[PDB]
Design a protein around this nucleic acid. Sequence first.
RNA 1: UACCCGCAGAAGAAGCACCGGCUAACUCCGUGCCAGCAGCCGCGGUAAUACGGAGGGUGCAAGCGUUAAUCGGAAUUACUGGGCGUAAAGCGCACGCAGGCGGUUUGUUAAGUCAGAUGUGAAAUCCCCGGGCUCAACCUGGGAACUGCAUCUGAUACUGG
RNA 2: UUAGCUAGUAGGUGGGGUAACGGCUCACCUAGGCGACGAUCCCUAGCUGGUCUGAGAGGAUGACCAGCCACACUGGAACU
Lengths: 123, 156, 205, 80, 129, 46, 82
Amino acid sequence: ATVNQLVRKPRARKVAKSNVPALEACPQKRGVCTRVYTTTPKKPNSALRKVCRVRLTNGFEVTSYIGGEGHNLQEHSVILIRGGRVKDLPGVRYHTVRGALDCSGVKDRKQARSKYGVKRPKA
Amino acid sequence: ELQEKLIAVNRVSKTVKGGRIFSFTALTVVGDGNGRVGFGYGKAREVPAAIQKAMEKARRNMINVALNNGTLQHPVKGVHTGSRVFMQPASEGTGIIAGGAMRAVLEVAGVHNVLAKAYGSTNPINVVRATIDGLENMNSPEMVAAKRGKSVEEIL
Amino acid sequence: ARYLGPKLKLSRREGTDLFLKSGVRAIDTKCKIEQAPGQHGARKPRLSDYGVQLREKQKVRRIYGVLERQFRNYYKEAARLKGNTGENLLALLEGRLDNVVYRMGFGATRAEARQLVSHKAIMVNGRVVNIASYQVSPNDVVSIREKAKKQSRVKAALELAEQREKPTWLEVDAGKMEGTFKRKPERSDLSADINEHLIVELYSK
Amino acid sequence: KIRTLQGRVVSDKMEKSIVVAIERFVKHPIYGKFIKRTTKLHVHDENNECGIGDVVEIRECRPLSKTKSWTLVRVVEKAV
Amino acid sequence: SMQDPIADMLTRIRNGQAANKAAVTMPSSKLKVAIANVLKEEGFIEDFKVEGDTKPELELTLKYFQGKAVVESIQRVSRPGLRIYKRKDELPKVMAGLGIAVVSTSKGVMTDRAARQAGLGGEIICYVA
Amino acid sequence: MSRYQHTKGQIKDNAIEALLHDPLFRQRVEKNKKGKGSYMRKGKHG
Amino acid sequence: MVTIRLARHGAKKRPFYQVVVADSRNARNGRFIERVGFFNPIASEKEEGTRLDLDRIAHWVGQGATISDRVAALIKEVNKAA
RNA sequence: UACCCGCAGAAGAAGCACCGGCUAACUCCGUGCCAGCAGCCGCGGUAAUACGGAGGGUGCAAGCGUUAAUCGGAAUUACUGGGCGUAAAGCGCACGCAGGCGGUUUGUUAAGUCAGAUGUGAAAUCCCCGGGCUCAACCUGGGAACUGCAUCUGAUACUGG
RNA sequence: UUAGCUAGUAGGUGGGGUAACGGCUCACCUAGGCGACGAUCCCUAGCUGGUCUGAGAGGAUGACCAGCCACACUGGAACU
Ligand SMILES: [Mg+2]
Ligand SMILES: [Mg+2]
Ligand SMILES: [Mg+2]
Ligand SMILES: [Mg+2]
Ligand SMILES: [Mg+2]
Ligand SMILES: [Mg+2]
Ligand SMILES: [Mg+2]
Ligand SMILES: [Mg+2]
Ligand SMILES: [Mg+2]
Ligand SMILES: [Mg+2]
Ligand SMILES: [Mg+2]
Ligand SMILES: [Mg+2]
Ligand SMILES: [Mg+2]
Ligand SMILES: [Mg+2]
Ligand SMILES: [Mg+2]
Ligand SMILES: [Mg+2]
Ligand SMILES: [Mg+2]
Ligand SMILES: [Mg+2]
Ligand SMILES: [Mg+2]
Ligand SMILES: [Mg+2]
Ligand SMILES: [Mg+2]
Ligand SMILES: [Mg+2]
Ligand SMILES: [Mg+2]
Ligand SMILES: [Mg+2]
Ligand SMILES: [Mg+2]
Ligand SMILES: [Mg+2]
């Protein structure tokens, strides 16, 4: 605080680590589904949240959430993950991208389609 | 002539043998758009009553503020509890650049052009108090001249 | 790049008449001007601090027919310029060629004026200008070109204008169909209902 | 008139050479405090006239060794 | 130790103002005297009086208006731990020009405005509001 | 249809029983709308 | 050697040449000793397309500076005009 | 080629996100702690403005969302601009070297300091007044700025010697 | 949570070398030289004009454009 003190030893910038380090400052990354499963959320929620353990293109073995109702994923299914954690799931820091690579877009979605990789139903 | 507006209304509880007793607190602030500003903090079992009370409070215990052409006279700090507030006069057309409770109080007072910032706590009741204090303390050129025993032209 | 939807809906939303129709017929007859658009129109929710400013901004934008990025740019320009910011912004808005045309009375609506501008009906200083966002400068004469002078719409527009209140900052000739943008308008010449200050504030958060 | 610097002789062991600390009184970039910063310089001196602790005026010149590109011009305050 | 006499003087003045004391006395110095003079000129005090030969005492007469103190605020700026010097274009404006800033220039201790007029900067001793 | 990843490790004697002593088949108790665990600081729309 | 030449500085289809003294080795729009004028071949009516600080150019020539053909032409034009 | 003139005919040309609060925008149906949502707080256990669809609305628009990344908000490393009795924070207490700071008077010096100048601080960029592309972006003339450094000539209140 | 490092090492004399000053090199002489104002060692990194952000002070950054540096399959070497 004393200016002398500061001069001696200046003020440390608070070095913030990233919460999505498997991405390695990439916006997405491709990976291979090592294992696809459901798990119970932490309290106070009840669900069977669909999630996939993925071996990434850059070496990392992460686990990734799969949003939308229903998915075609299984083992050896090449997918893109994007970052974003699911709060209720212990340890999930990444979402899969619906509508990239082996992951399908959601069936019969009419709203927020772009988020679930669904094309505009032409009529 | 007096424009008045409610900043924040908040539900607060007392606990009793039965269970909880809820009540409402209304923080209002009134002013004539020239020098005068007054804030009021009313409390009642239902909201409208509380608001009314606050308004009543506000209307009495007002305070005059030395305004120069719809803005402050010099940069002023103001504090109350955690809420320490800074407010600086600014050029005609800048608008009120002010946060939360503060914005309200300024508007009713009649300052049209300010650059403010709220440091510390931004607890509405305290921050309004702080702002009012700042406004109150802020002296004019004429006043300063009077105090120091000079003409206004000598001070500038 | 243009709003192509219902026009009176916008007006309803704002609350006021934005002059998005010619004014042959009164706005109260064309719509429920008091009630807002949609299922939940009659309900009037209490508007936030943020909300009111936003609404104000929309109103102005709607009036002139400027989309958001352009509006932002204009605001920035105003800020940069010396003097009062809101006022500057207003002036800039006025300056638009389509707006000027509308004022003159060659377009019934601003939309009409814009269309005319687009279609190469309008000359600024004897040179066909096509852009509606074109800032007209002081002492610039702006005129209907001879090919567009036979249009029945133009005369109708002129007639309509004659009913309306004429601007002090222009001088327009109905027979010649040329108007001189004499000076950039003062704030007192423009409408008092517009609270430009709110708009200014909005672009500072 | 030539550019020249003053300083106390921090050592004078190495023959025909001395090291001359030069105090410069800079202001700190951020904090605004004025700090005494130091500049040791290997200075050439023929005849070995300078003592240790001695104040001495020096000028810059063509390099005389790996580390020695300053020469002394006059010694001052040579008390012990 | 006493490490700042000007600062001490300022503090004394402030305390006098707080406590509604008519006059405030302290060990005199030349710089201090100059400061006092400046204050007098600017009208933040009524008078000052240096008294004694061997160890002289400056006595400032504090000033009140409508029951309250004229010296609303009075801060050191330059201080022994951290000196502040400004150039003429960088000279501070206290209270948007209402308050004064006592600056020690090459041509003596003067108010900020005076310094500006002269066309010279210097060590900014203190602000007074 | 995805597999539930149970916390029992390697099931030996009986699967159903194991599952029953698992989070998937944990007890759920609802939050009271009125009564004991009933106080809400903020409404659903508050 | 040092030369006096145009450096292309405009947009696509709208060139604007800055006339620069420069060591010939340096790239066209790169390092240069002095900028001693400009030339605008797309310049409209009622605006100066060309402007050469002639004295500077002369000085450079004296020192031993070669001149671009285009630059020479420009100079000639300037001379004529004046 | 830009640009201009003529031809026909509304003709070939609108999506994306969002609508519990923060945050502009609300209803019905389906589901029933499931399916799902989620930035935070949380929602969903049979009347869900929070899930999914629809109608209606809001915001942006040839884009609109998501992810990543930086600064901001964050006065949350506080030089400007924080703190330490009880919230995190006074070494268990002292002595003391380096270091930081130094009562008062005169003289001198002129290092800090201040003032003026000279040289430089590339051009581009940023900003100001202009000019050119129909406007803009873009290009461009001239300025200002580049808070610096060095040297010379002064001032000497303050700090230093 | 790297505290000691350095023998051409620091300086001298004289030869040699360079376009040029110079431990650049060599022979001898002296025992120095650097280091808590961070030497040495480790990790990361091309630098600047600028760029982004910010009221500013700062923080982050160095694609494009322009200045400088280094590299040209890897490691060495010289010739012209
Ligand atoms: Mg009792
Ligand atoms: Mg566009
Ligand atoms: Mg402005
Ligand atoms: Mg929501
Ligand atoms: Mg809302
Ligand atoms: Mg959603
Ligand atoms: Mg339902
Ligand atoms: Mg929904
Ligand atoms: Mg910060
Ligand atoms: Mg704190
Ligand atoms: Mg405790
Ligand atoms: Mg504690
Ligand atoms: Mg203790
Ligand atoms: Mg002293
Ligand atoms: Mg000096
Ligand atoms: Mg100078
Ligand atoms: Mg430059
Ligand atoms: Mg133009
Ligand atoms: Mg002195
Ligand atoms: Mg002295
Ligand atoms: Mg030799
Ligand atoms: Mg030799
Ligand atoms: Mg590298
Ligand atoms: Mg900030
Ligand atoms: Mg290769
Ligand atoms: Mg090789």
